[PDB]
Design a protein around this ligand. Structure first.
Ligand SMILES: Cc1cc2nc3c(=O)[nH]c(=O)nc-3n(C[C@H](O)[C@H](O)[C@H](O)COP(=O)(O)OP(=O)(O)OC[C@H]3O[C@@H](n4cnc5c(N)ncnc54)[C@H](O)[C@@H]3O)c2cc1C
Ligand SMILES: Cc1cc2nc3c(=O)[nH]c(=O)nc-3n(C[C@H](O)[C@H](O)[C@H](O)COP(=O)(O)OP(=O)(O)OC[C@H]3O[C@@H](n4cnc5c(N)ncnc54)[C@H](O)[C@@H]3O)c2cc1C
Ligand SMILES: CC(C)(COP(=O)(O)OP(=O)(O)OC[C@H]1O[C@@H](n2cnc3c(N)ncnc32)[C@H](O)[C@@H]1OP(=O)(O)O)[C@@H](O)C(=O)NCCC(=O)NCCS
Ligand SMILES: CC(C)(COP(=O)(O)OP(=O)(O)OC[C@H]1O[C@@H](n2cnc3c(N)ncnc32)[C@H](O)[C@@H]1OP(=O)(O)O)[C@@H](O)C(=O)NCCC(=O)NCCS
Ligand SMILES: [Cl-]
Ligand SMILES: [Cl-]
Lengths: 565, 565
């Protein structure tokens, strides 16, 4: 009978524990968790903060006693593993209740410790008004400061998903908020010009967003003076637990009631470095594709481990829940000798940003420029369903691919509806190895409430494949401010549309009058075309090229240019 | 120049005509449409009847004048092609206004004439209160009877997509409705036990639904008496345009103010039969995969043409707008010599049924049995996003597959949320050639407002792969009422649930007490196991099989069984 020990009782480890029991009734299974709870909803925590998850009880999916009754697994809460002795096959655990220790033997071990929020070397950061959010007790501490310091202004630092969901939760509660990010964008899985849609939705809601900005120093000032109604002062905007004074990278001062630090997570590697297990160059535990670590008796999975990038095959860190549940179930397999291989990670993700969703899968343009992978890019801005049926919303969509083989590198989407469906389709298509050209032949669901005769994805294909075939020639948003004396700029929108914004120096010929009015444009210039989203631009480009003109169409049209600035 | 003539100015014909112009400015393009409108939204028609789509101008996407301006195509409204002389490369054209006819020559011709509603051989069916729905003027006639006949009760015949949409539209107007279907189910793209979810939701809204029934005779009675207020009569529930009395196949009479006939459509083939063109055994125009008919200078696409079934490679009839628009695009390519080949049709479809959507891709169980293909099926009933975040809904989902090769045959889903996204994923997965074993590694979008750590699709994959690998042994809803003396029925729900329905003779041991209570079950019988959905049943199965019992799990649990009756 195999004695199995599991370190961590959440997404990785709880999922191996239940799987391993279905596989064998004879094994001994013991799962350690240093916290009070197992199988809690990490992803739910900012939503319980704002009240959107009304019921604390809903964040707890399994208990020690339920794991015992259903799966016979002995789960020990408030028990922290403090060492692994590999030659002996024993682990030392500490009982947090009283600080005593004992040892336990294993036949095989699974490490599933996750990743801890990043500590930044900021003077004065460590203080009673400053918190990071990983678990339920972190959430209760945040709640308790909100109540007790009567929070009216708050600052979040970092524009990744945890930061944006804290920001949104704080705003749900009536709190005035400021978000700082050092980058020139929120959410880094999406490129800069796609993040612009998010920046404007965030500023439309009264949030003070400051990009390109760092937090230099934190000054915590204890409240010395308790105002009171018996002294006849105003006690409504009082903060009894103190005040934060922040210095920013540009010497400005920001006064605040609460600071939340959401600048990312680092893998939990201390038990593994202390036992001599291999660490990768990203600082995560190194595992083979069977999820085994340098020691064949020891497995690891989840936030703590490095994975293989699906597109490139290189190491990457991607702390998401999906991969961690399916890795733990596969480790349980392999611990009974199935020899199953995990198939790489795409980084499929999505985040709510007030009324928008922001979604992506595979590689963005920054990661491709930086690894020297040649690529091309397309944008469309296409209704989430038939436009003649109410509630349709613009889906802004980006597609990164190899301009020659048609390989799918990545996809990004942004809008108020149907983004979770476009990113799922592209995730499936890429994982199954489809190329752009094949994307053209997708037969998706169409009735008017749900979709359109040609889907967002079909239109993106045709635009990408037209470039690959040489039936289209592009000019991107970043090239169009910089024209040469051989290029003539041409706006093919209608004249009423021009008061929304255009580009300095365009001649205006509306697409519907172009055929007739053509001789107006000299054939000794490369005509550089744009419309609102790139579609009327394409029509104009075909008429010009069909009559012997040299031409280019701005992909994404003015809408992509305008959100990119 | 190449001279191109198109018959039909809707989904197939229009898409060819705009594409053909982006390919060539020197081509001559003429498109004939027998009616008043080109590029209308067929699919929006029932929704404008209900007022959903408020504006009669939202149904019109291009005009003759817009197609002249944008694409220099000459469109001729109220011109019907009445003959094709293939040998001469001339068509004969009748001018509606006049009845005058002329000839027009062509280098290449596209037939995209659509499919007309089926005429049933029913005595008295042709009358002023009875209509089917193909185009804008069909729609205007329906609205006009509704108004003029003060419609308070109506009958719809046929339970496919148009029937179900007209029934919803009429209910949305406060009209009492009856739906009659000869089959034992609405929506034949999904099997009978999936349609039961739809049967209940339609009777829940007070629609009088009569399955297994036909309409044998229609008797139309003019109204002789005009009730008047001056005569001191109630004028409120009068129908001055008359009354319908229907006789059904069981001999019952049905009294109604309006009859809608939605029993299917049949390809327009008369021009093609008259010209000598080949026609398949299903009665559609026969084409190769480049969209060319038995005459190489003549192309055909859309509702009029038999297609190649993706899964089996045989002929099928599938009148849907996605296919029609992409085929007409491709036909234009081919006419300029690109030799592109379509790739088969999956029959991806979705229909709104009150708050449910009912969707499907691939083959159903009916079509598999009939064609003698060996298959297996799984069911799952999984929350549409993390059920700890509000608004999550049950997605009932069926997967059809090859139990040894893992080939994906079909998928079906019904429920209040997220059905479009599940069906698009499976349509992507099957068109790309993925197997059920590969679906287990799908990495989808998860954030609590949208998805779950394991999606509906990961769960279905795991359940089916377990069967394929011999880790599960299924019994289905249609076998469980049998049972021999070698079999013993076990219900592993909690006692409290037996309250909502069960199976007679079951011995109740709840799964969380089963490990301890298990000596109660004798080893010399195969234990036949059931819970609500099949998830707890799986866990009970693994416990018994792991202790040397013979066992089966009821796949889909009691839920799937309940909705099959
Ligand atoms: C606020 C927030 C929102 C999130 N939103 C999403 C989302 O929307 N979508 C998504 O895909 N992902 C999301 N995630 C990330 C997701 O929570 C993780 O990626 C997944 O939980 C990783 O599982 P894990 O088992 O590796 O680690 P964890 O869930 O962190 O579990 C590890 C457990 O190990 C315990 N432990 C560590 N060391 C020891 C020790 N030595 N002895 C005993 N116990 C130990 C810890 O206390 C911890 O409870 C979110 C995370 C947070 C914090
Ligand atoms: C009420 C309704 C709801 C629908 N909903 C959906 C849905 O939700 N999803 C979906 O995928 N599909 C739906 N459809 C079906 C979809 O509309 C068809 O699949 C598609 O329009 C077929 O395109 P087509 O070009 O073959 O035919 P059509 O669009 O019917 O166009 C053919 C044209 O040919 C003309 N014509 C015929 N013969 C001649 C001739 N001799 N000379 C000149 N003109 C001629 C006709 O008058 C017609 O206007 C719906 C259809 C209806 C009727
Ligand atoms: C819940 C948890 C304990 C896993 O328990 P589990 O019993 O493996 O999980 P599920 O409820 O998902 O059940 C899956 C099993 O049911 C089976 N199944 C699912 N639906 C079924 C159905 N309708 N009929 C038959 N079997 C079904 C599956 O095949 C699977 O079993 P398998 O792995 O042996 O193939 C673990 O995921 C967890 O603790 N999650 C919460 C913590 C977390 O993930 N947080 C991350 C941040 S949100
Ligand atoms: C509208 C209709 C006339 C076709 O016109 P169309 O110009 O081909 O159609 P679209 O608007 O979808 O445009 C697609 C073209 O724009 C291009 N495109 C789409 N978005 C683009 C973008 N933002 N930038 C550059 N090009 C873009 C596509 O590549 C494509 O050109 P291509 O075929 O040469 O590759 C025909 O579809 C129709 O009449 N529809 C209504 C009738 C109907 O289908 N009803 C049946 C069921 S409701
Ligand atoms: Cl445009
Ligand atoms: Cl169940």
């Amino acid at each position: 009978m195999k004695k199995i020990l599991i370190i961590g009782g959440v997404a990785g480890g709880a999922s191996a524990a239940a799987r391993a029991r279905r596989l064998s009734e004879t094994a001994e299974i013991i799962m350690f968790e240093r916290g009070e709870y197992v199988s809690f909803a990490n992803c739910g925590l900012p939503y319980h903060i704002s009240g959107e998850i009304a019921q604390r009880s809903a964040l707890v999916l399994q208990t020690p006693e339920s794991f015992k009754a259903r799966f016979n697994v002995e789960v020990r809460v408030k028990h922290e593993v403090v060492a692994i002795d590999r030659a002996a096959k024993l682990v030392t655990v500490r009982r947090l209740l009283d600080g005593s220790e004992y040892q336990e033997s294993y036949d095989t071990l699974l490490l599933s410790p996750g990743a801890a929020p990043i500590v930044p070397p900021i003077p004065g950061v460590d203080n009673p008004l400053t918190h990071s959010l990983r678990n339920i007790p972190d959430m209760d501490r945040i709640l308790q400061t909100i109540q007790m310091n009567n929070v009216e202004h708050a600052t979040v630092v970092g524009g990744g998903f945890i930061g944006l969901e804290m920001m949104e939760s704080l705003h749900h509660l009536g709190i005035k908020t400021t978000l700082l990010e050092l980058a020139d964008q929120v959410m880094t899985p999406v490129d800069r010009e796609m993040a612009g849609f998010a920046h404007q939705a965030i500023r439309d809601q009264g949030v003070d967003l400051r990009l390109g900005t760092a937090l230099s120093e934190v000054s915590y000032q204890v409240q010395t003076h308790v105002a009171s109604d018996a002294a006849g002062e105003d006690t409504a905007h009082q903060h009894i637990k103190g005040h934060l004074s922040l210095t920013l990278s540009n010497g400005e001062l920001l006064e605040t009631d609460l600071l939340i630090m959401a600048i990312g997570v680092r893998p939990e590697t201390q038990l593994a470095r202390d036992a001599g297990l291999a660490i990768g160059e990203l600082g995560g535990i190194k595992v083979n594709a069977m999820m085994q670590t340098s020691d064949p008796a020891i497995y690891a999975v989840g936030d703590a481990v490095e994975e293989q990038d699906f597109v490139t095959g290189q190491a990457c860190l991607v702390p998401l829940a999906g991969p961690a549940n399916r890795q733990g179930r596969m480790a349980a397999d392999n611990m009974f000798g199935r020899e199953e291989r995990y198939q790489g990670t795409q980084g499929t993700a999505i985040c709510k940003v007030f009324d928008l969703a922001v979604g992506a899968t595979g590689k963005n343009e920054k990661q491709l420029k930086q690894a020297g992978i040649a690529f091309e890019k397309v944008y469309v801005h296409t209704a989430s369903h038939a436009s003649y049926y109410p509630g349709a919303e613009v889906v802004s969509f980006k597609l990164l691919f190899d301009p020659v083989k048609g390989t799918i590198f990545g996809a990004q989407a942004v809008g108020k509806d149907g983004i979770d469906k476009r990113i799922d389709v592209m995730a499936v298509a890429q994982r199954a190895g489809m190329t752009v050209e094949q994307l053209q032949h997708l037969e998706l669901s169409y009735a008017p409430p749900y979709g359109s005769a040609k889907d967002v994805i079909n239109q993106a294909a045709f635009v990408a494949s037209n470039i690959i075939k040489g039936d289209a020639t592009p000019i991107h948003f970043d090239q169009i401010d910089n024209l040469s004396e051989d290029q003539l700029l041409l706006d093919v929108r209608n004249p009423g549309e021009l008061q929304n914004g255009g580009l300095e120096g365009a001649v205006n010929i509306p697409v519907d009058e172009l055929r007739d009015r053509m001789h107006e444009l000299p054939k000794d210039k490369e005509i550089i075309i744009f419309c609102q989203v790139g579609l009327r631009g394409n029509v104009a480009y075909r008429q010009l090229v069909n009559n012997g003109y040299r031409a280019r169409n701005l992909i994404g049209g003015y809408r992509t240019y305008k959100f990119a600035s």
